[PDB]
Write a structure and sequence with these properties.
The structure is cut from a larger assembly and holds one copy of chain A (76 residues), one copy of chain B (431 residues), two copies of chain C (126 residues), two copies of chain E (110 residues), one copy of chain F (57 residues) and one copy of chain H (62 residues). By secondary structure, chain A is mainly alpha-helical. In chain A, 41% of the residues lie in helices and 9% in strands. The relative contact order of chain F is 0.07. Classes of the chains: A mainly alpha (76), B alpha+beta (431), C mainly alpha (126), E mainly alpha (110), F mainly alpha (57), H mainly alpha (62). The structure holds protoporphyrin IX containing FE (3 copies) and the ligand COc1c(O)c(C)c(C/C=C(/C)CC/C=C(\C)CC/C=C(\C)CC/C=C(\C)CC/C=C(\C)CCC=C(C)C)c(O)c1OC. One protoporphyrin IX containing FE binds next to helix 3 and helix 5 of chain E.
Chain lengths: 76, 431, 126, 126, 110, 57, 110, 62
Amino acid sequence: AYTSHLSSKTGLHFGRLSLRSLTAYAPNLMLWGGASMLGLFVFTEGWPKFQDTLYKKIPLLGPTLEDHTPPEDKPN
Amino acid sequence: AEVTQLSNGIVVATEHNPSAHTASVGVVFGSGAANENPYNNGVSNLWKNIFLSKENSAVAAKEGLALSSNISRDFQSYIVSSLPGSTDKSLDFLNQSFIQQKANLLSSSNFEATKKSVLKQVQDFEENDHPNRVLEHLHSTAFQNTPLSLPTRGTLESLENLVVADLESFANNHFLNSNAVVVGTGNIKHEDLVNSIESKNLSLQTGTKPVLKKKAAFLGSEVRLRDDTLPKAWISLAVEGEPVNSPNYFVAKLAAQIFGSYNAFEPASRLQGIKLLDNIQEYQLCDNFNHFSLSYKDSGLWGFSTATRNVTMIDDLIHFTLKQWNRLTISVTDTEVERAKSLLKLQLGQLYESGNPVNDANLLGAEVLIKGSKLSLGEAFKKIDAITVKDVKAWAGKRLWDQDIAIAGTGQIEGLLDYMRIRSDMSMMRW
Amino acid sequence: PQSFTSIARIGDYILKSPVLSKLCVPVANQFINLAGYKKLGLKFDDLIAEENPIMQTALRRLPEDESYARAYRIIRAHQTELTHHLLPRNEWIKAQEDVPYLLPYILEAEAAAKEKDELDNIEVSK
Amino acid sequence: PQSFTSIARIGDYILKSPVLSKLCVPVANQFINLAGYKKLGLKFDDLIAEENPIMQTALRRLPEDESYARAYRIIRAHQTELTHHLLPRNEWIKAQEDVPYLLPYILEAEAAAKEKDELDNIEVSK
Amino acid sequence: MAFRKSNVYLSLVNSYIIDSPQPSSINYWWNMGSLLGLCLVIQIVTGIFMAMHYSSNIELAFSSVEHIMRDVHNGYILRYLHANGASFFFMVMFMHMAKGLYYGSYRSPR
Amino acid sequence: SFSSLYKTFFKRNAVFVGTIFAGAFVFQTVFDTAITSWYENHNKGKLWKDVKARIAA
Amino acid sequence: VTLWNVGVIIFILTIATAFLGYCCVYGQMSHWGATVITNLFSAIPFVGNDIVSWLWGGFSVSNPTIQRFFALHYLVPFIIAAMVIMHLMALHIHGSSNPLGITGNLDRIP
Amino acid sequence: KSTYRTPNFDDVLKENNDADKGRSYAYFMVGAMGLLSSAGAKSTVETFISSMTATADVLAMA
Ligand code: HEM
Ligand code: HEM
Ligand code: HEM
Ligand SMILES: COc1c(O)c(C)c(C/C=C(/C)CC/C=C(\C)CC/C=C(\C)CC/C=C(\C)CC/C=C(\C)CCC=C(C)C)c(O)c1OC
């Protein structure tokens, strides 16, 4: 058949940002979320508040953070 | 439409077209510039100008025939064009002037005059044709020390040593029945052409062509022919592409169509639906560019060629064009693929469906010497239509994302940065 | 940063309504007189901020005679304000002279930029 | 900072004295051999500091073919030094090739500059 | 153009440590300048953190340094870093000045 | 395969950076424990814990 | 817009500098004003109490706090001087504005 | 000599040129440098922060 016109629509967007570009970038923006949690654990390892609720419950790397000094060896 | 027969070693293929006003016949050999060595480079260029010599072409004009010849990396062709009904004389001319009798053409004062003219054709090509001599150095640096690196026109230093005895060696090794296809295009029937060939002897040599030891392999490298007296800069940049007999042959071709060509001095070229244009137009970065996808028997090349007068912002031009290549792996859209589909079908329908039977003969003969047949235009349209966005992303992630590149340039190219700065742009740290 | 296309769309609806025109237009005339830019020898179209691409396009396409006159009104206003005075009453801009001379050029440039944004985000059906 | 006019004045006096030319030159040839610039592919005239106005005119007036060759020798030495190696012994600059090619263009530019200074401090014998 | 060249603040970074054109022949003696920049940062940061526990009275100055070594956590690391870092500051600076004396970096244009 | 190794860890920078951080967390705890163990064993009999238990006999 | 945002940063740094110097007198308002500002950070849901202990250097406003507040009151003014230069750099791009609110490119004086 | 004759580079070239194999080798060595640099940065930040918590004499009077 003969075509005499083009049929089209307009995609949802706001400025330089579009819905299609957001959908393509969405799976990779979650990996960057997980790469920032991993980098946060590295820098808060010495914080004892985070040790007692998160890091000491790791199966193999957990117990190696516990201190085993007897009370008779501590002045405070 | 294409009909292909076999006869004792030679292959006959035709593309009949009754509406044509001119028939064309000739012979296409399946050996080209990639079948020479760095010491006999330019032999196939001498054989082309010997065929089109003044004395040879004067004989053809009396009968009303016109001659043509083309030299490529893989094939060379010799064509004779004439009016319909004069096809019998064209076959006769080809037989007794090139196929069976080469002694009269290879006489002295005819070889010495032709060699004088070709030596001048390559001297001015090497110092006047800049865009086409950086695309030749791109092949030279990307396929160095492999057969796919020798220029098709030959070398000035190599052509001063060729003698008449070198031309007979090449003819004995390559102009053979097992390396040849007889073609006929325009207003000529398949039955008529094959009947004429068998009515005569029309037999080439008997031996087989020598095989090449090493195949072509891509190497990331660069060559810089800096010249501060020229007014512009010409740059070619490419990655390894696809061979002719590949499943990703049409996907790579469609990928080059997404970025396309550009002319700064054409009002309608500045309105194209290419997202790269809005980056390079605020500051005039280049005068023109084109994206290509060249395929051969062993390998290919995929990239672009540029020419600019903005010599202080070459880095900006390269940075922006390579950042758009990255989106072919991560964020290419559905509208871009649909537009490139329509423009590729138009471009293919303007190359195979032109009005020149000489152009058709080269195209048809070269496609049969490689895969034994010719794919129709209707079937190719069905393959282009089937391409999806997931196909493009898979192909780009394999060939483009974080890969080695080849660079060639000449002119004022001080502003072109080093290899490592450019190669860093083949990927993004934000992804 | 409200588009002039949006201002014109709202403004026209008021002017074509007989009820709204009689209650809103009298207020707008008193609003303009109290603003007092005419007492410095300026039209309103001289007050629009110009540091954007849309207004740089419109000012490029303005005819030379209009462009020369606008440059004189702007220079005169800077020197009058420098002295902390007003212009003499006979040099003030009249109401019939305060016409939107630059508005048609602004609307034409705004319509082109909107159609470019709707074609860059096009989606082909079927 | 010592001018080549003064350098040549002392040098030419030495080279014309039979006694002085007999002991100074043999120790000057050994001094140049130990300097070692010829082993990088350089002549002495390529080592002169060029950031003064006098040497900028001399390099401007140098014939075009000699200027292209000098650019290659300078780029070659930078690449050789970058690798911490020396050039192969067949690529070393020989004694008969280490000629003062730029010297005439320096002595002529310096003479013109000296005459200008003497003419800005002219005193007519009134 | 690139955002690294058009921005007001990034263009000073780009022009000094990114796109700066350097000769291809400079050896490792041209590395002492960047080392002196790291020495100055080390001395400022260790001095500030030590100054939170220091008293300048002549009757408490000596005892405040002994307080840093013994009572402050990792305080001996800060003090030995600051005292030895100042010795390494002058080591590099002496070599930095002798490089320019050997290579004539004091001459006319500079 | 070497193609699968590149596709999993080296193609996306997010996975490459996350792997470096997760490898630094494991290295941090293991390196400390292995150092004190060697340091204590090299000085057996000179530590307070050693001499405290000896006088407790 | 960028010139406006740098000024907001300068405003924040100036408030902190004035507060730190007011504590260096250690009067009745100085002491008691510091235990109602530093105690504000104790309201953070997690590790809010650990922050105030690290800021205090102890269990309340005491000698560790006053000595470290003087070291910071010496430093922040030099950071302010560095952001003023960045303030002037962003102003020099398009120049200043005028009370008329229109372009000033037609009439300029040095 | 022609400009299409490339010089000899065989003394520095590697016999096997695999993109996947030769890129994983290079990224393993820049990822090892970044792993140890990341661990050394945590040590440096913790040393300075910890010197501000509470001195030994203050903790004695708790
Ligand atoms: C904190 C002190 C200093 C710092 C941070 C510093 C920084 C630098 C840097 C980064 C360079 C360029 C890189 C290099 O040449 O290595 C440089 C070059 C130079 N510096 Fe310094 N410098 C300092 C002190 C000095 C001193 C004390 C002198 C001389 C008395 C000096 C003289 C020079 C010279 C002459 C050069 C140029 C040399 C050349 O490029 O050939 N500097 N400086
Ligand atoms: C280039 C910068 C600096 C240099 C070269 C320098 C040098 C020195 C030297 C040599 C000492 C003697 C230490 C000893 O012998 O044990 C010292 C002590 C000291 N410095 Fe610095 N200093 C610098 C910066 C600073 C700054 C910026 C501060 C504070 C903000 C500071 C604070 C101190 C203190 C508190 C001491 C006390 C003694 C000690 O802790 O050892 N310093 N400095
Ligand atoms: C923007 C810069 C500064 C501001 C706004 C500022 C503000 C203040 C304020 C509000 C006080 C309280 C004084 C009172 O209430 O009686 C003070 C005290 C003090 N400041 Fe500053 N200051 C600045 C810079 C500096 C600098 C750079 C130093 C030292 C190098 C300094 C040293 C002092 C001292 C020693 C006191 C002791 C208390 C007094 O003398 O009143 N100030 N400052
Ligand atoms: C390789 O390229 C480079 C190069 O990258 C660099 C940096 C330099 C060095 C150049 C410079 C100009 C040096 C830069 C440094 C300075 C001018 C001085 C540095 C200033 C500081 C370190 C001051 C910063 C101080 C602090 C942040 C104070 C710390 C205290 C804190 C955080 C207190 C804790 C906070 C609270 C609320 C309790 C080069 O010479 C160079 O070669 C060309």
